[PDB]
Design an enzyme around this catalytic site. Structure first.
Site, PDB file in Angstrom:
ATOM      1  N   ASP A   1      51.182  95.773  75.193  1.00 16.51           N
ATOM      2  CA  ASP A   1      50.889  94.650  75.993  1.00 16.51           C
ATOM      3  C   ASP A   1      50.545  95.049  77.414  1.00 16.51           C
ATOM      4  O   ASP A   1      51.316  95.964  78.034  1.00 16.51           O
ATOM      5  CB  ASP A   1      52.968  95.274  75.636  1.00 16.51           C
ATOM      6  CG  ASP A   1      53.024  93.666  76.851  1.00 16.51           C
ATOM      7  OD1 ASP A   1      53.122  92.934  76.557  1.00 16.51           O
ATOM      8  OD2 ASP A   1      53.362  94.579  78.195  1.00 16.51           O
TER       9      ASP A   1
ATOM     10  N   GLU B   1      48.359  91.835  73.080  1.00 17.02           N
ATOM     11  CA  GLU B   1      49.327  90.595  73.834  1.00 17.02           C
ATOM     12  C   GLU B   1      48.758  91.040  75.470  1.00 17.02           C
ATOM     13  O   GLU B   1      48.685  92.112  75.954  1.00 17.02           O
ATOM     14  CB  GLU B   1      50.502  90.413  73.924  1.00 17.02           C
ATOM     15  CG  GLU B   1      51.404  91.760  74.063  1.00 17.02           C
ATOM     16  CD  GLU B   1      52.790  90.675  74.114  1.00 17.02           C
ATOM     17  OE1 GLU B   1      53.604  90.588  75.022  1.00 17.02           O
ATOM     18  OE2 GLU B   1      53.531  90.581  73.115  1.00 17.02           O
TER      19      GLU B   1
ATOM     20  N   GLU C   1      54.054  87.481  82.349  1.00 17.18           N
ATOM     21  CA  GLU C   1      54.526  87.514  83.442  1.00 17.18           C
ATOM     22  C   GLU C   1      55.735  87.188  84.617  1.00 17.18           C
ATOM     23  O   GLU C   1      56.374  86.413  83.928  1.00 17.18           O
ATOM     24  CB  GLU C   1      53.122  86.557  84.794  1.00 17.18           C
ATOM     25  CG  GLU C   1      53.025  85.368  84.135  1.00 17.18           C
ATOM     26  CD  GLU C   1      51.930  84.589  84.680  1.00 17.18           C
ATOM     27  OE1 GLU C   1      51.066  84.706  84.300  1.00 17.18           O
ATOM     28  OE2 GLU C   1      53.389  83.682  85.665  1.00 17.18           O
TER      29      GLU C   1
ATOM     30  N   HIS D   1      63.938  67.050  71.751  1.00 21.43           N
ATOM     31  CA  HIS D   1      62.736  67.561  71.803  1.00 21.43           C
ATOM     32  C   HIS D   1      61.604  66.330  70.820  1.00 21.43           C
ATOM     33  O   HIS D   1      62.310  65.887  70.093  1.00 21.43           O
ATOM     34  CB  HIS D   1      62.314  68.813  70.474  1.00 21.43           C
ATOM     35  CG  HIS D   1      62.787  69.895  71.600  1.00 21.43           C
ATOM     36  ND1 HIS D   1      63.996  69.948  71.419  1.00 21.43           N
ATOM     37  CD2 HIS D   1      62.009  70.630  72.163  1.00 21.43           C
ATOM     38  CE1 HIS D   1      64.329  71.359  72.266  1.00 21.43           C
ATOM     39  NE2 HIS D   1      63.342  71.558  72.147  1.00 21.43           N
TER      40      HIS D   1
ATOM     41  N   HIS E   1      86.254  92.751  92.922  1.00 22.02           N
ATOM     42  CA  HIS E   1      86.487  91.083  92.331  1.00 22.02           C
ATOM     43  C   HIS E   1      86.528  91.644  90.318  1.00 22.02           C
ATOM     44  O   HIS E   1      85.531  90.449  90.120  1.00 22.02           O
ATOM     45  CB  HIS E   1      84.965  90.856  92.580  1.00 22.02           C
ATOM     46  CG  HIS E   1      84.666  91.040  94.038  1.00 22.02           C
ATOM     47  ND1 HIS E   1      84.789  92.245  94.799  1.00 22.02           N
ATOM     48  CD2 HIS E   1      84.203  89.858  94.532  1.00 22.02           C
ATOM     49  CE1 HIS E   1      84.569  91.893  96.208  1.00 22.02           C
ATOM     50  NE2 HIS E   1      84.045  90.590  96.063  1.00 22.02           N
TER      51      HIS E   1
ATOM     52  N   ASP F   1      79.520  90.149  97.927  1.00 27.75           N
ATOM     53  CA  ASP F   1      79.347  89.632  99.265  1.00 27.75           C
ATOM     54  C   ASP F   1      78.498  91.169  99.615  1.00 27.75           C
ATOM     55  O   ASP F   1      77.665  90.365 100.894  1.00 27.75           O
ATOM     56  CB  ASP F   1      80.390  89.140 100.189  1.00 27.75           C
ATOM     57  CG  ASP F   1      81.722  89.773 100.066  1.00 27.75           C
ATOM     58  OD1 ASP F   1      81.196  91.113  98.869  1.00 27.75           O
ATOM     59  OD2 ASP F   1      82.805  89.952 100.346  1.00 27.75           O
TER      60      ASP F   1
END
EC number: 3.1.-.-
Length: 1279
Positions: free
Chosen positions: A9, A715, A719, A793, A1211, A1242
């Site tokens: 790769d 291959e 990206e 499609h 949270h 946050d």
């Protein structure tokens, strides 16, 4: 011992690699680890990823274009072609090839006598006069002329071709234009160019200026501005000098001009700034450019001929001469001041600059058009200038393939006729074809390699060379032995005895007998009465016959014997051998008139020699043994008592002669890997990455004990989607919408304004793209109810996998498309075509989309449609990837059979990075880049699986994605004409054209009907098991969950601010001991390595152990307690060294959670996955646990870990998508490398950096090989 394959790769910052074996597993191996630790062995999976920066290093310099490299490797090709001709050439003109070589150093004669030399230049003022004559030749043509034609092409060709490069059927202006726009549209899916009904041949090959032809073409592309990116490419290929700074918002002015010497480097510096995605775009511009310039040129010729380029260039030659003749008279007469500026000053654009000084045509016209306008009588000269026709030169055809094929056509014509008179040409058709056309990586087998046997590209000496005959005489004498009155054994002749004998006997008689050696030397000089002589027989065979020859002509024995005239006399004999005609000898001999009378020079000019030796001066007198400084001839003259001779000296391992000869046979046996990569079109990073890939494969073959892999599957790294180019895409969608809503005159942007970043939503984009309306039914859609509507499609997934906007419409219900399994129904096309047309003209659908919606009107999906679907998914069209394939194919397949055919034992497979990306999504092997660097390795693994599965399942498709010349099957003869024709394993491979359908257990059709496939896929004809859906997906999940993956951050020694090359470990005094880390600067480096201690002492250190000076390059890796690792960065700082691994179960969860709303896919399958996210909410704890466990052990940033841990608890009740999206941020706390601040919810978490490098001096240094598989560990604690 079993077979394996490698998956690769390749990226600009990462090479990923994986060896796989039977059943798609990843083997493991124990690897001996070196050094001073009590760890001696480590077990390692064979899967990894190399990570590299791209800056100023020596390896970078090696991958730059290097002229002396080009020169030498091109000389191999030139020289090889001479070898093939050498035999028959010897029958025509034995000195031809040597003559040409002497004239290479004149920066001139080609023939031996003055008659032929004058007649050659009268008839062939240019290479095209020659080509045309040869092509028109009815009978046997002079072999020198044939050679000269071929040699001129291969001398001046920029670069030769690799497999699959030739395409003679699509070498015309129109198709090359489409290629450009197709390549352009690949890169700008949102603002593609419709080129339909554009006569690019007629617009671009006109008798108009470049600037007009630009405007004419750009005027036919609705919405495209002249200085936009596509206009600038057209500007580039028309011959102008566009500036790409504004198209890409570059730093500086970056202008490009194809004809400039620096264009190739200039393009790579641009790619280095904008990305190597663009390289094929500028390659399409270049080939278009060549097709345009050949049409304009070939248009001048009107004669039907197999040499149409030659015929044209001759015409332009004659026209150039008249026009230049007139321009010179006009200027001499009207502007005599400016004559030398115009015609001699290469420093300025102008005629001189234009031809010999690298000023381009437009730069020249720009300079000379005002000069012409202010002169009288320049009317038609100015006409020619404005149609780009004035004073065209001849050198506009060394580079590019479109050029190459035109040249090859003419040369093949010459060879086809001349084969009938020169059997050796028929005998070497394929060799000569390879020399003319293709890269030659190695000269072995059929292409294995007059010239000196020891030094391949070095030419020999004349056989009557005086130096040669001295070598001959001395080589014989150094093996004479004598035995005298007072001796028990014989002895070798002395240095002085040999010189004595040469002076006394070899310089007084032509032949020297053994009687003379005994009487005239051993009796009369050495005063011996009994002497027996071995090593020579009746008389010596070597004679100094040219010494005697010249002694009669010069009549100055002092002159011959004087050692300083040795190369004068060498030059004279060369001249008397190269030529056969007194006038031409006497021309060359005239420089020596101050040394000989006219009496003597009339005699010298009559003394021709013929014949060439076997060895070159460089070998015999030239290369020097390192220690002794002596040449070979020096040793033949005196060599102690050893008295070695030539054959001895070549082979003596105690003398560098042997090694230099081998260094030269190596250089001449093939071309240069680094030069090859240096000349690719791409950034320096893409080139560093290709060199690493070659290194990784080499080490992997070493690891598997020298056994070659079955296949290598390559291959190009998919990206990453930066948010920067993500919002650039929003701006693009907005511009396409605004421009399309304007042309439609629809008020939809005013009825519903929308800021561009909202257009990232697939459905909202499609809603505006469709002017508020359903696409299959004449009705509005409610912008507030898009959740209820379908994305359909146009071409079903069963036939091709295309999830782009270009294959999707937004309906109310997918049932509206019609009930067929194929494209939308013929009833829908009728009611909707007129709407679609309006959309197409508004550039809100493309020509491809429109043709696909309406395809039912033309019979639906043809065999041809399907065959192109196959190629669309299989064939990776990037150029640089074709070169990576050849480089590996070259290295792997080197043996030839008894036919002189290449035995391909390693298949080099190339795949579009999309295939793997679809595979991860279709089968839930999701990628979450943020966790670690493993996904590079994972891609290489998956790529190796998908590639080797395909080749086994569909062998006949080989030609489309395996490098080599394979049997080309027509894909349409592989397409069944009904689906039931495929229930048996007859030769047809597909009815549903998604090649990846064989992995699926059930395929869904466009209407809803579902076809099942067997759990085990076999290859039709061989019966071999290819993929077992019950086992093999589990194998893949196992490899991906595997925690130990070899990650290696390449270390670097820098070369380009107080910049450090590498640090070093000093153990020394300042007294009591210190272990200190000292950085050598790039200036310091030269000094420091010369004398290490003296440099180190002058810094305050003394009593240093020089065997404990360890070199420490950037990113050196250290292990401390609990497997915590640290990398040594610049500026006295350390980087995070540990990679945190997570299993598939967690990765998939994190993925599907952060995609809980964005969930593209089937409506029932979308809930099955949302259920998974819901039902596994507890993975949030399980992950946070691992991150914490990891962080406290190796990260050591307790402050931030507390903040993170506190914020996670608070949270814990926000929706799951949110906590996951925020956990994905956390991984930047654990990420390998430079610590960097991030935000959790946050909260902002500031980077805890590592400011003390003291720590490492007692840790363990881990030195990694490229794969990280071979370690050597150095415990610095015990130093």
């Amino acid at each position: 011992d079993k077979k394996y394959s490698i998956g690769l790769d390749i990226g600009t910052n990462s090479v990923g690699w994986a060896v796989i074996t039977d059943e798609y597993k990843v083997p493991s191996k124990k690897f001996k680890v070196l050094g001073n630790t009590d760890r001696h062995s480590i077990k390692k999976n064979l899967i990894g990823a190399l990570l590299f920066d791209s800056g100023e290093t020596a390896e970078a310099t090696r991958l730059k274009r290097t002229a002396r490299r080009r020169y030498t490797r091109r000389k191999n090709r030139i020289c090889y072609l001479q070898e093939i001709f050498s035999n028959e050439m010897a029958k025509v003109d034995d000195s031809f090839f040597h003559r040409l070589e002497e004239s290479f150093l004149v920066e001139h004669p080609i023939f031996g006598n003055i008659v032929d030399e004058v007649a050659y230049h009268e008839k062939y003022p240019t290479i095209y006069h020659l080509r045309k004559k040869l092509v028109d030749s009815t009978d046997k043509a002079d072999l020198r002329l044939i050679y000269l034609a071929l040699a001129h092409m291969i001398k001046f060709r920029g670069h030769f071709l690799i497999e699959g490069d030739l395409n003679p059927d699509n070498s015309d202006v129109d198709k090359l234009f489409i290629q450009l726009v197709q390549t352009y549209n690949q890169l700008f899916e949102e603002n593609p160019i419709n080129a339909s009904g554009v006569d690019a041949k007629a617009i671009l090959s006109a008798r108009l200026s470049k600037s007009r032809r630009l405007e004419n073409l750009i005027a036919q592309l609705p919405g495209e501005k002249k200085n936009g990116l596509f206009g600038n490419l057209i500007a580039l290929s028309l011959g102008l000098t566009p500036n790409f700074k504004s198209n890409f918002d570059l730093a500086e002015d970056t202008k490009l001009q194809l004809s400039k010497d620096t264009y190739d480097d200039d393009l790579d510096n641009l790619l280095a700034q904008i990305g190597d995605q663009y390289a094929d775009l500028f390659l399409a511009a270049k080939n278009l450019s060549d097709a345009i310039l050949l049409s304009d040129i070939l248009r001048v010729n009107t004669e039907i001929t197999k040499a149409p380029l030659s015929a044209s260039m001759i015409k332009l030659y004659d026209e150039h001469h008249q026009d230049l003749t007139l321009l010179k008279a006009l200027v001499r007469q009207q502007l005599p001041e400016k004559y030398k500026e115009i015609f001699f000053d290469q420093s300025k654009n102008g005629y001189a600059g234009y031809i010999d000084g690298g000023a381009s045509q437009e730069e020249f016209y720009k300079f000379i058009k005002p000069i012409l306008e202010k002169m009288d009588g320049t009317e038609e000269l100015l006409v020619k200038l404005n149609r780009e026709d004035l004073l065209r030169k001849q050198r506009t055809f060394d580079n590019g393939i479109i050029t190459h094929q035109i040249h090859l056509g003419e040369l093949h014509a010459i060879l086809r006729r001349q084969e009938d008179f020169y059997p050796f040409l028929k005998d070497n058709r394929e060799k000569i074809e390879k020399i003319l056309t293709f890269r030659i990586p190695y000269y072995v087998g059929p292409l294995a390699r007059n010239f000196d046997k020891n030094l391949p590209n070095e030419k020999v000496l004349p056989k009557h060379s005086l130096l040669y005959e001295y070598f001959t005489v001395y080589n014989e004498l150094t093996k004479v032995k004598y035995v005298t009155e007072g001796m028990r054994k014989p002895a070798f002749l002395s240095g002085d005895q040999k010189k004595a004998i040469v002076d006394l006997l070899f310089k007084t008689n032509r032949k020297v007998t053994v009687k003379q050696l005994k009487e005239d030397y051993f009796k009369k000089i050495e005063c011996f009465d009994s002497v027996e002589i071995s090593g020579v027989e009746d008389r010596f065979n070597a004679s100094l016959g040219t010494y005697h020859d010249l002694l009669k002509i010069i009549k100055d024995k002092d002159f011959l014997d004087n050692e300083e005239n040795e190369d004068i006399l060498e030059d004279i004999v060369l001249t008397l051998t190269l030529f056969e005609d007194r006038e031409m000898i006497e021309e060359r001999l005239k420089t020596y008139a101050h040394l000989f009378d006219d009496k003597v020079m009339k005699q010298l000019k009559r003394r021709r020699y013929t014949g060439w030796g076997r060895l070159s001066r460089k070998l015999i007198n030239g290369i020097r043994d390192k220690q002794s400084g002596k040449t070979i001839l020096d040793f033949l003259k005196s060599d102690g008592f050893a008295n070695r001779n030539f054959i001895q000296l070549i082979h003596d391992d105690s003398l560098t002669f042997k090694e230099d000869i081998q260094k030269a046979q190596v250089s001449g046996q093939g071309d240069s890997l680094h030069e090859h990569i240096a000349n690719l079109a791409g950034s320096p990073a893409i080139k560093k990455g290709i060199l690493q890939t070659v290194k990784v494969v080499d080490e992997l073959v070493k690891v598997m004990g020298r056994h070659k892999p079955e296949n290598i599957v390559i291959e190009m790294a998919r990206e990453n989607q930066t948010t920067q180019k993500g919002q650039k895409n929003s701006r693009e969608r907005m511009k396409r919408i605004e421009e399309g809503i304007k042309e439609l005159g629809s008020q939809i942007l005013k009825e519903h304004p929308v800021e561009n970043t909202q257009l990232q939503n697939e459905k909202l984009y499609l809603y505006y793209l469709q002017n508020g309306r359903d696409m299959y039914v004449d009705q509005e859609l409610d912008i507030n109810r898009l959740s209820d509507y379908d994305v359909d499609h146009i071409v079903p997934q069963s036939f091709l996998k295309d999830d782009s906007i270009d294959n999707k419409v937004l309906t109310r219900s997918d049932k509206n498309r019609g009930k067929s399994d194929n494209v939308p129904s013929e009833e829908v096309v009728k009611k909707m075509k007129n709407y679609w047309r309006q959309l197409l003209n508004a550039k809100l659908i493309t020509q491809r989309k429109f043709d696909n919606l309406t395809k039912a009107e033309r019979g639906g999906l043809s065999e041809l449609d399907k065959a192109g679907f196959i190629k669309r998914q299989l064939v990776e069209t990037r150029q640089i990837t074709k070169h990576v394939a050849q480089i590996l194919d070259s290295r792997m397949n080197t043996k030839y059979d008894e036919n002189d055919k290449l035995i391909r034992e390693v298949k080099v497979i190339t795949l579009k990075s999309k295939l793997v990306s679809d595979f991860r999504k279709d089968f839930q092997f999701y990628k979450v880049r943020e966790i670690n660097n493993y996904h590079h390795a994972h891609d290489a693994y998956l790529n190796a699986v998908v590639g080797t599965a395909l080749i086994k399942k569909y062998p006949k498709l080989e030609s489309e994605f395996v490098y080599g010349d394979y049997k080309v099957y027509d894909v349409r003869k592989m397409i069944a004409k009904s689906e039931q024709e495929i229930g048996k394993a007859t030769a047809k491979y597909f009815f549903y054209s998604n090649i990846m359908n064989f992995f699926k257990t059930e395929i869904t059709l466009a209407n809803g009907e579902i076809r099942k496939r067997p759990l085990i896929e076999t290859n039709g004809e061989t019966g071999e098991i290819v993929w077992d859906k019950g086992r093999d997906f589990a194998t893949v999940r196992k490899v991906l969950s595997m925690p130990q993956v070899n990650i290696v951050k390449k270390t670097e020694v820098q070369t380009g601010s107080p910049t450090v090359a590498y640090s070093v470990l000093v153990v020394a005094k300042v007294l009591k001991s210190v272990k200190e880390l000292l950085g050598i600067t790039i200036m310091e480096r030269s000094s420091f390595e010369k004398n290490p201690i003296d440099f180190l002492e002058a810094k305050g250190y003394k009593e240093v152990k020089k065997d404990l000076i360890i070199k420490l390059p950037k990113y050196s890796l250290f292990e401390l307690e609990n497997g915590r690792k640290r990398m040594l960065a610049s500026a006295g700082v350390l980087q995070k060294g540990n990679e945190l691994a997570l299993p598939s179960k967690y990765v998939n969860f994190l993925y599907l959670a952060s995609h809980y709303e964005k969930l593209k896919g089937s409506p029932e399958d979308n809930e099955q996955k949302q259920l998974f996210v819901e039902q596994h909410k507890h993975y949030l704890d399980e992950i946070i646990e691992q991150i914490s466990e990891f962080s406290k052990r190796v990260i050591l940033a307790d402050a931030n870990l507390d903040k993170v841990l506190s914020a996670y608890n608070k949270h814990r009740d926000k929706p799951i998508r949110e906590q996951a999206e925020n956990i994905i941020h956390l991984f930047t706390l654990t990420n390998l490398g430079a610590p960097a601040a991030f935000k959790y919810f946050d909260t902002t978490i500031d980077r805890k950096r590592y400011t003390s490098t003291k720590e490492v001096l007692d840790a363990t240094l881990i030195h990694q090989s490229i794969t990280g598989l071979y370690e050597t560990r150095i415990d610095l604690s015990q130093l």
